Amino acid sequence: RTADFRTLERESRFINPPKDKSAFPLLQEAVQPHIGSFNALTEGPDGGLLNLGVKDIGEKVIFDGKPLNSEEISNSGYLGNKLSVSVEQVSIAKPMSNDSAVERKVYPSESRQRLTSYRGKLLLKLKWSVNNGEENLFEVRDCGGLPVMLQSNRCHLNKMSPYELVQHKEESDEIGGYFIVNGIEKLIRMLIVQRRNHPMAIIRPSFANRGASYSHYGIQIRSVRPDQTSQTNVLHYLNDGQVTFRFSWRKNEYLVPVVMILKALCHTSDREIFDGIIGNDVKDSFLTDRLELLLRGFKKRYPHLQNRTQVLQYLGDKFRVVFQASPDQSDLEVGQEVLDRIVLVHLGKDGSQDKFRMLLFMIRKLYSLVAGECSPDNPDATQHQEVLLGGFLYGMILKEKIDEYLQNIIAQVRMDINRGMAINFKDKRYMSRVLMRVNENIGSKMQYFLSTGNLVSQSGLDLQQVSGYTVVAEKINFYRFISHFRMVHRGSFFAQLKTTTVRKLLPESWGFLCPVHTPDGSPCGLLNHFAHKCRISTQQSDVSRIPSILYSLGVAPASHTFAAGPSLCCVQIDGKIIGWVSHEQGKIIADTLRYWKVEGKTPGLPIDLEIGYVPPSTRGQYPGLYLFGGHSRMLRPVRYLPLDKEDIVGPFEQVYMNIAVTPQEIQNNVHTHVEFTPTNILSILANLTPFSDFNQSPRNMYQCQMGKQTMGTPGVALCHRSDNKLYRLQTGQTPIVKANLYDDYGMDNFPNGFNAVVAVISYTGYDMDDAMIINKSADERGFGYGT
Amino acid sequence: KAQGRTVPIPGVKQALEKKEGLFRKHMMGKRVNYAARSVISPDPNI
Amino acid sequence: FSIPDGFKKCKHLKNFPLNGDNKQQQVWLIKFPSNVDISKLKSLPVDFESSTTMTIDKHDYKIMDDTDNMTLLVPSESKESLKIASTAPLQFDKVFSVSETAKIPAIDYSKVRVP
Amino acid sequence: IVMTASAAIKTPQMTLPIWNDVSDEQADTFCKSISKVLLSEVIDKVIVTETTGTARSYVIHMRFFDNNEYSEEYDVSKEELQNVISNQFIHLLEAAIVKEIKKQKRTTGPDIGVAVPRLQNMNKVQRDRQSAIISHHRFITKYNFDDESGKWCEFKLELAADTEKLLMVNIVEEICRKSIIRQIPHIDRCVHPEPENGKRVLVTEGVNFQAMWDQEAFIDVDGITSNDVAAVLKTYGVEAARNTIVNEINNVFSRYAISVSFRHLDLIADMMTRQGTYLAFNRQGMETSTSSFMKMSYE
Amino acid sequence: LRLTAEGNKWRTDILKTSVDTGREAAAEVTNLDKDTPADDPELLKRLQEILRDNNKSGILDAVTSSKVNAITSQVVSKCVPDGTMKKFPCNSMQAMALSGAKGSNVNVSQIMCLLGQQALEGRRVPVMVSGKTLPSFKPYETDAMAGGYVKGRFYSGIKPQEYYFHCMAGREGLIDTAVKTSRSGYLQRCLTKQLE
Amino acid sequence: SEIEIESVQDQPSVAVGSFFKGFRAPSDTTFDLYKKKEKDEFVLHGENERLEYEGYTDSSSQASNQYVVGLFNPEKKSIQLYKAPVLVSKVVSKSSKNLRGPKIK
Amino acid sequence: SSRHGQKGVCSRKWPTIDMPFSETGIQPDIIINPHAFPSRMTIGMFVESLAGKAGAL
Amino acid sequence: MIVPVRCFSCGKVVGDKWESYLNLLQEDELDEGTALSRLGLKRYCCRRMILTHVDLIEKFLRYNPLEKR
Amino acid sequence: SVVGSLIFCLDCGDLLENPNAVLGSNVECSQCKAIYPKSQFSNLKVVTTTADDAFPSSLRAKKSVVKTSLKKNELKDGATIKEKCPQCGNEEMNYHTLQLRSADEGATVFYTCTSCGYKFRTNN
Ligand SMILES: [Zn+2]
Ligand SMILES: [Zn+2]
Ligand SMILES: [Zn+2]
Report DSSP letters for A353-392, one per residue. Answer: HHHHHHHHHHHHHHHHHHHTSSPPP-TTSGGGEEEE-HHH
Q: Rounded to 5 degrees, what angle do the CA atoms G7, G12, G17 make?
A: 120
User: Any idea where the domains of chain C sit in the sequence?
Assistant: 1-115
For residue F81, the Cα-to-chain-centroid distance in whole angstroms is: 17
The contacts found for F75-80 with CB under 8 angstroms, 24 or more apart, are F77/F3, F77/F4, F78/F3, F78/F4, F78/F5, F78/F6, F79/C28, F79/C44, F79/F3, F79/F4, F79/F5, F79/F6, F80/C17, F80/F5, F80/F6, F80/F7
H6 contact residues in A (CB cutoff 8 A): 781
The structure was resolved experimentally with: X-ray
Closest to A384 in 3D by CA, of A196, A189, A191, A234: A196
How many alpha carbons fall within 13 Å on the CB side of residue A8?
15
- Expressed in Å, this structure's resolution amounts to 3.0
- Span from the CA of I85 to the centroid of ligand 3 (angstroms): 6
Q: Rounded to 5 degrees, what angle do the CA atoms D232, D236, D237 make?
A: 90
Label residue A510 exposed, middle or buried (CB < 10 Å: 0-12, 13-18, 19+). Answer: buried
Beta-carbon contacts of A641 under 8 Å, excluding residues fewer than 6 positions away, are A666, A671, A672, A673, A674, C107, C112
d(CA A178, CA A151): 9
- Span from the CA of I117 to the centroid of ligand 3 (angstroms): 8
Q: Is A767 on the interface with E (CB under 8 A)?
A: no
Beta-carbon contacts of A209 under 8 Å, excluding residues fewer than 6 positions away, are none
How many alpha carbons fall within 13 Å on the CB side of residue E175?
21
Helix and strand totals (H; E) in chain C: 1, 8
- Which of helix, strand or coil describes residue F70? strand
Beta-carbon contacts of G56 under 8 Å, excluding residues fewer than 6 positions away, are A736, A755, H44, H45, H47, H48, H51, H52
Beta-carbon contacts of E111 under 8 Å, excluding residues fewer than 6 positions away, are E1, E93, E153, E154, E155, G41, G43
Give the closest ligand to the alpha carbon of residue I10. 2
DSSP string, D58-120: EEEEEEE--HHHHHHHS---HHHHHHHIIIIIHHHHHHHHHHHHHHHHH--SPPSSS-B----
Helix E18-29 with E54-79: angle, nearest 10 deg? 150
What's the Cα-to-Cα distance from A527 to each of A512, A588, D42, rounded to whole Å?
14, 39, 49
Judge contact between E173 and A501, C-beta under 8 A.
no
d(CA D228, CA D15): 11
Cis omega (within 30 of 0) for bond into E81? yes
State the residue range of the domain holding F17. Answer: 1-105
CA-based R_g, chain G, Å? 13
Q: Is I119 on the interface with D (CB under 8 A)?
A: yes
Alpha helices in G1-57 (DSSP H): 37-40, 43-56
Q: Is H19 on the interface with A (CB under 8 A)?
A: no
All chains having 3 or more CB pairs closer than 8 angstroms to chain G: A, B, E, H, I
How far separated are the first and last CA of chain B, in Å rounded? Answer: 60
Listed by the residue before each break, gaps in chain D with C–N over 2.5 Å are: 54, 120
CB contact under 8 A, I65 and E30: yes
The two beta strands, I6-7 and I2-3, are antiparallel
Q: Provide the β-strand partners of residue C62.
A: C99
Q: What is the 3-state secondary structure (H, E, C) of A395-433?
A: HHHHHHHHHHHHHHHHHHHHHHHCCCCCCCCCCHHHHHH
Closest to A524 in 3D by CA, of E174, G4, E119, I103: E174
Other C-beta atoms closer than 10 Å to the C-beta of A90 total: 27
Closest to A678 in 3D by CA, of A453, A552, A515: A515
What region does I111 belong to: left with phi over 0, alpha with psi -120 to 50, or beta? beta
H12 annotated to a ligand binding site? no
Beta-carbon contacts of A224 under 8 Å, excluding residues fewer than 6 positions away, are A196, A197, A230, A231, A345, A346, A630, A631
The two beta strands, A252-257 and A243-249, are antiparallel
Beta-carbon contacts of C52 under 8 Å, excluding residues fewer than 6 positions away, are C45, C46, C62, C63, C64, C65
Judge contact between A486 and A529, C-beta under 8 A.
yes
- AA identity, residue D147: D
Q: Provide the β-strand partners of residue A649.
A: A636
D175 contact residues in I (CB cutoff 8 A): none
Alpha helices in C1-115 (DSSP H): 109-112
Q: For chain G, what percentages of helix, strand and coil (3-state, to nearest 5) are there?
A: 35, 20, 45
- Which of helix, strand or coil describes residue A191? strand
Q: Which strand (E) or helix (H) includes residue A294?
A: helix A285-301
In total, chain A counts a number of residues equal to 787
How many alpha carbons fall within 13 Å on the CB side of residue A41?
29
Judge contact between C81 and F13, C-beta under 8 A.
no
Positive or negative CA dihedral for A586, A588, A591, A592?
A: negative
d(CA D246, CA D266): 6
In total, chain F counts a number of residues equal to 105
- Span from the CA of I92 to the centroid of ligand 3 (angstroms): 9
Cis omega (within 30 of 0) for bond into E89? yes
The two beta strands, G9-14 and A771-775, are parallel
Task: Compute the CA torsion angle A316, A321, A325, A328 (nearest 10 deg).
Answer: 80
- Which of helix, strand or coil describes residue G41? coil
Which of A762, A766, A768, A770 would you mutate first to test chain B, the one with the most B CBs within 10 A? A766
Same domain for A406 and A503?
no
Nearest residue on chain A to C101, judged by CA atoms?
A553
Judge contact between B42 and A766, C-beta under 8 A.
yes
d(CA A331, CA A313): 5
Other C-beta atoms closer than 10 Å to the C-beta of A120 total: 23
Judge contact between F52 and F46, C-beta under 8 A.
yes
Residue A186 phi, psi (nearest 5): -120, 140
Closest to A509 in 3D by CA, of A414, A336, A413, A384: A384
All chains having 3 or more CB pairs closer than 8 angstroms to chain E: A, D, G, I
Q: Which strand (E) or helix (H) includes residue A687?
A: helix A684-688
d(CA B42, CA A766): 6
- AA identity, residue A622: Y
- Span from the CA of C84 to the centroid of ligand 2 (angstroms): 19
Judge contact between I120 and I112, C-beta under 8 A.
yes
Q: Rounded to 5 degrees, what angle do the CA atoms A662, A665, A668 make?
A: 130
What region does F97 belong to: left with phi over 0, alpha with psi -120 to 50, or beta? left
The two beta strands, A119-130 and A82-92, are antiparallel
User: Any idea where the domains of chain I sit in the sequence?
Assistant: 1-124
Q: Which strand (E) or helix (H) includes residue F78?
A: strand F78-83
- Span from the CA of H35 to the centroid of ligand 1 (angstroms): 16
DSSP string, E126-149: ---TTS-SSTTSPTT---TTTTTE
Closest to H43 in 3D by CA, of A736, A777, G24: G24
Q: Rounded to 5 degrees, what angle do the CA atoms A497, A501, A503 make?
A: 75
Same domain for A366 and A258?
yes
Positive or negative CA dihedral for A515, A521, A527, A533?
A: negative
- Which of helix, strand or coil describes residue F86? strand
Judge contact between A489 and A190, C-beta under 8 A.
yes
How far separated are the first and last CA of chain G, in Å rounded? Answer: 24
Closest to A233 in 3D by CA, of A189, A197, A179, A286: A197
Q: For chain B, what percentages of helix, strand and coil (3-state, to nearest 5) are there?
A: 20, 0, 80
All chains having 3 or more CB pairs closer than 8 angstroms to chain D: A, B, E, I
Q: Which residues of D64-80 are buried (b: 16+ CB within 10 A; e: fewer)?
A: bbebebbbebbbbebeb
Other C-beta atoms closer than 10 Å to the C-beta of I68 total: 18
State the residue range of the domain holding A326. Answer: 197-378
Sheet holding A385-388, edge to edge: A385-388, A190-194, A487-489, A527-529
Nearest residue on chain A to E167, judged by CA atoms?
A697
What's the Cα-to-Cα distance from C84 to each of A652, C80, C81, F54, F90, rounded to whole Å?
46, 12, 11, 14, 15
Label residue F69 exposed, middle or buried (CB < 10 Å: 0-12, 13-18, 19+). Answer: buried
Other C-beta atoms closer than 10 Å to the C-beta of B9 total: 7
Cis omega (within 30 of 0) for bond into G20? no
Task: Compute the CA torsion angle A391, A397, A401, A404 (nearest 10 deg).
Answer: 150
d(CA A62, CA A26): 53
Closest to A129 in 3D by CA, of A87, A74, A182, A77: A87
Judge contact between A646 and A639, C-beta under 8 A.
yes
How far separated are the first and last CA of chain H, in Å rounded? Answer: 23
d(CA A237, CA A245): 10
- Count of domains in chain F? 1
Q: Is G54 on the interface with B (CB under 8 A)?
A: no
Q: Which strand (E) or helix (H) includes residue I61?
A: helix I58-62
A274 contact residues in I (CB cutoff 8 A): 3, 6, 8
Label residue F28 exposed, middle or buried (CB < 10 Å: 0-12, 13-18, 19+). Answer: exposed
Say yes or no: domain H1-69 is CATH 1.10.10.60. Answer: yes
- AA identity, residue A236: H
Other C-beta atoms closer than 10 Å to the C-beta of A574 total: 19
Judge contact between A709 and G7, C-beta under 8 A.
no
d(CA D70, CA D153): 15
Distance (Å) from the alpha carbon of I74 to chain A's nearest alpha carbon: 30
